[PDB]
Homo-oligomer: A and B are copies of this chain.
């Protein structure tokens, strides 16, 4: 009776932070969706510090503390995902965390670039994946935050 109960936690990785509203609209939708399932969002801008290294360390700690990462690997400033988000996905992988990814554009890299090379003749990967192969770990690439969250609920029960 009255045993400790773990509250599930998801790190909310993605470039929403660079939106004009600093991600408010995105994060508010995330907060509302997760609240219904008693899941805590760990959001990059929470209790934000002023120094770069402190912001970084707090985000790494959120990844260490999380049960899963849901990462927005949508195109950012071109066809490639955000590198900060990629760093966080790498952190999560090394820590053996559940990593779930989605993107607004699921086409293969070569379809995105329209060729096996970019405008500067640099090679575009040909593995039938929507982004750099380091970012794919065998879990389905989802089409939305919500679809990724459904996988979380099915595969990480309370």
Contact = CB atoms under 8 A, between A and B. Distances in A.
Interface of A: 15, 17-20, 22, 52-53, 55-56, 59-60, 63, 76-95, 118, 121-124, 127, 129, 131-138
A71 to B, nearest CB: 11
Given A89-B90, A94-B60, A94-B90, A84 B134 contact: yes
Give the number of times this chain occurs in the complex, counting copies.
2
Contact of A18 (B77, B86, B122): B122
A127 B52 contact: yes
B78 A78 contact: yes
Contact of A88 (B63, B90, B118): B90
A90 B86 contact: yes
B20 A123 contact: yes
Nearest to A132: B84
B59 A121 contact: no
A85 to B, nearest CB: 8
A77 B19 contact: no
A118 B15 CA distance: 13
B56 A137 contact: yes
Contacts of A118: 77
A88 B90 CA distance: 6
